[PDB]
Structure formats: C-alpha cells, structure tokens
Amino acid sequence: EDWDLVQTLGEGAYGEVQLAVNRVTEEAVAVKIVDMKRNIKKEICINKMLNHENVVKFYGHRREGNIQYLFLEYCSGGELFDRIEPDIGMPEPDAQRFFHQLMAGVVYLHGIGITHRDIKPENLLLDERDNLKISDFGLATVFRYNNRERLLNKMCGTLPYVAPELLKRREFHAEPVDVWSCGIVLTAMLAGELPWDQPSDSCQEYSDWKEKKTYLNPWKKIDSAPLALLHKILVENPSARITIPDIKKDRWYNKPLKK
Numbered sequence: 001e002d003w004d005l006v007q008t009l010g011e012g013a014y015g016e017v018q019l020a021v022n023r024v025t026e027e028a029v030a031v032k033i034v035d036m037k038r039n040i041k042k043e044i045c046i047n048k049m050l051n052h053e054n055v056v057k058f059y060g061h062r063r064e065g066n067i068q069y070l071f072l073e074y075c076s077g078g079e080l081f082d083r084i085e086p087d088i089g090m091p092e093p094d095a096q097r098f099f100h101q102l103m104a105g106v107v108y109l110h111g112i113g114i115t116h117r118d119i120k121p122e123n124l125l126l127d128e129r130d131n132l133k134i135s136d137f138g139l140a141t142v143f144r145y146n147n148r149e150r151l152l153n154k155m156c157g158t159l160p161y162v163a164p165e166l167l168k169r170r171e172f173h174a175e176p177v178d179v180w181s182c183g184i185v186l187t188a189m190l191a192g193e194l195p196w197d198q199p200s201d202s203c204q205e206y207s208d209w210k211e212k213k214t215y216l217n218p219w220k221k222i223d224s225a226p227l228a229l230l231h232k233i234l235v236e237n238p239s240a241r242i243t244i245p246d247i248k249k250d251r252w253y254n255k256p257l258k259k
C-alpha cells in the first residue's frame with residue numbers, strides 16, 4: 001500500500017525514475033515521475049496493452065495532482081548499455097542471448113501493432129537473471145489497428161540508431177525502422193562502438209559501409225557469421241531489408257554458442 005522511495009534509477013527529461021520498496025511485502029518496483037506542468041496519456045494506455053517477459057511489466061498509475069506516477073517493473077541489472085565495454089563490447093554468446101530476447105520483444109510488440117521507435121541499449125533493462133526488457137514507450141505508437149497498417153511520418157528516436165529512411169522519406173513502415181535499430185544494438189554489442197553518427201550520405205562511415213569497406217574499425221572486430229547477418233539488417237532500402245522472421249532463420253542466430 002505504501003512505497004518507500006529508496007534511490008534514483010534514471011533522471012530522464014520527463015522528471016525521474018526511482019526504486020520503490022513496499023514496506024510490508026518488501027517487493028521492489030520503479031516509479032517514473034511525470035510532473036505534466038514541468039502524450040503521457042498514450043504512454044500510459046500503451047502500457048495497459050503490454051504483457052510479455054521481454055517488456056517492462058506495467059502495474060498501475062496513482063493520479064496525484066499533475067505528478068503522474070508510473071508503477072513499472074524493477075530491472076535490478078540496469079542497462080544493457082553498462083555491459084558493453086568501450087571498443088570491445090561483450091562475449092559473442094552474451095550478444096546472441098540478448099539479441100534473442102530483443103527479437104522476442106520486438107516480435108511481441110510488432111504482433112500487437114505497436115512500434116517502440118527508440119530501441120538502444122539505454123532502453124534495454126536487465127532483471128536479476130540478466131533477462132532483457134524493452135523499456136519506455138514514450139515515443140512508441142500504434143502502427144497497425146483493425147489489421148490496417150498506418151505509415152509513419154513523424155521523425156524521432158536517437159540518430160546513430162535511427163534508420164536511413166527516417167531522414168530521406170516523408171512516410172515509412174514502422175517495423176523495418178525497428179529492424180534497423182536492433183542491428184545497431186547488435187553492432188554496439190559486438191564492437192563496443194556505434195558505426196556512424198547518423199545513417200547519412202553526408203556521413204563518411206555510412207558511405208564506407210554501403211561501399212562494403214568492412215576492413216574498417218567496428219566491422220573488423222565482428223566475426224564473419226554475425227557480420228553476414230548485419231549485412232542483411234543494415235540494408236538502406238527498407239523494402240529489401242531482412243524482416244524479423246528471416247533474422248530467425250539466419251545461420252548466426254541459430255548457432256550454438258552459450259551453455
């Protein structure tokens with residue numbers, strides 16, 4: 001019934017997220033704190049559509065004044081971001097497990113017609129068993145409803161992760177952006193650096209990639225199998241881009257790596 005607020009979790013633009021601990025049951029939860037006067041509805045009513053074990057569980061919302069209280073899953077292992085050591089990344093079996101559950105979640109969401117629009121290691125939280133959870137549907141929206149897709153036109157996300165067509169086109173399909181950002185997480189995961197600042201013609205590193213100069217700083221660190229899969233994801237024409245069911249068929253993905 002009453003929730004002690006133990007320590008901060010992430011001081012976001014919205015306000016802050018805090019660890020919260022139940023005085024009787026000792027169960028720990030996280031309370032994102034939206035002071036509307038210093039959008040938050042859609043994020044709430046999206047949260048009521050969600051129920052999966054690779055997505056932050058949503059509990060309820062105390063409506064005190066304008067200080068909206070978002071009662072969400074505690075992820076005690078924090079951010080996939082803090083398990084990528086710079087310029088090296090992590091062990092290739094650890095990458096695969098995390099990319100498996102990224103795919104479990106994106107499939108699950110895409111299944112119900114919602115797109116996250118901001119997949120990046122900062123938005124993948126890990127529980128006590130390092131089990132990955134997709135977090136913060138603040139920029140997430142409906143793109144399929146009554147089994148009719150709606151095209152996106154609003155630009156958003158985080159540049160280095162964002163898909164090329166979110167910058168050259170006026171309308172674009174929600175799922176291939178999501179296919180593109182998860183591959184930038186694959187690449188972070190395996191190299192420990194991001195390939196380019198933004199997927200642009202004006203950007204040297206993305207020009208190289210499209211020219212297939214794969215003897216250059218992040219790709220050289222990536223094994224031929226996962227790099228074969230990244231050549232399929234980070235395709236510039238989102239119509240030829242590998243779709244999630246094809247990702248599920250790929251050689252690397254189905255390779256036995258971890259006990």
Ligand SMILES: Nc1ncnc2n[nH]cc12
Nearest residue numbers: 009010017030073074075
């Ligand atoms: N930043 C955060 N740290 C831990 N658990 C969380 N859940 N939702 C956001 C979180």
